[PDB]
Amino acid sequence: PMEEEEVETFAFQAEIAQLMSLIINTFYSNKEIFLRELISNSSDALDKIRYESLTDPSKLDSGKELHINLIPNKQDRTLTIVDTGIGMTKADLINNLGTIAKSGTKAFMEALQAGADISMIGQFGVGFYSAYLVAEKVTVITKHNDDEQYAWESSAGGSFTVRTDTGEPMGRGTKVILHLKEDQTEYLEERRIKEIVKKHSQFIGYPITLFVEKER
């Protein structure tokens, strides 16, 4: 029986779109800091559910372990960052990953134009879009307590989509799937992922596990 699924397509807020275009169409050295930014987001989401669970322990019914997993896939060219943090409601996805203006966007594009290192992006409140230094397409699957599981996706170009996810259930948290550009496949190698976690993410207060598919 054919299934029916609803999709909604949204426009990025105009300066977020301009920043995405700037990130994608300009050369930056130091692209490896995307991983730091995504791990920081996962750590922030883990802090949220940790503190929520102190006032309501049933918020951990959807899984007690608080951790971050990194999953490179050399066959389909994706790098996946999974956490068991708070997750995002449908409204959170829409608001927080693209529709609401961020006050630091303009400042950051001025800084980049003046020659700032792309590493400065976190300072400006727009760290997630560092994913587009290395990824042509990003898919965010997320499950928050008392909302359903949703998938956000964008290949930039000014729009993103949100749909209810009918894929593999996660109990609670967020998975960010980077579909890597062809020249950024270094970030599938275990050595390189270890190097950059050690460089940039060594004081995160939750365990990180790197899962490496047996070499083919």
Ligand X SMILES: Nc1ncnc2c1ncn2[C@@H]1O[C@H](COP(=O)(O)OP(=O)(O)NP(=O)(O)O)[C@@H](O)[C@H]1O
**Strand 159-164 relative to strand 135-143: parallel, antiparallel, unpaired?**
unpaired
Q: Which does 154 bind (CB under 5 to 8 A by kind): Mg ion, ligand X, none?
A: none
Nearest to 19 by CA among 123, 98, 137, 91: 98
Residue 127 engages ligand X in binding (rule: CB under 6 A) = yes
Select 41 or 149, whichever has its Cβ closest to ligand X: 41
Residue among 63, 122, 158, 171 that touches ligand X (CB under 6 A): 122
Select 83 or 165, whichever has its Cβ closest to ligand X: 83
Residue 98 engages Mg ion in binding (rule: CB under 5 A) = no
96: left (phi over 0), alpha (psi -120 to 50) or beta: alpha
d(CA 7, CA 135): 22
- Min dist CB 41 to Mg ion, Å, is 4
Distances 94 to 21, 27, 30 between C-alpha atoms, Å: 19, 29, 29
Contact residues toward ligand X (CB under 6 A) are 37, 41-42, 44-45, 83, 85-86, 88, 96-97, 122, 124-128, 174
Contact residues toward Mg ion (CB under 5 A) are 41, 127
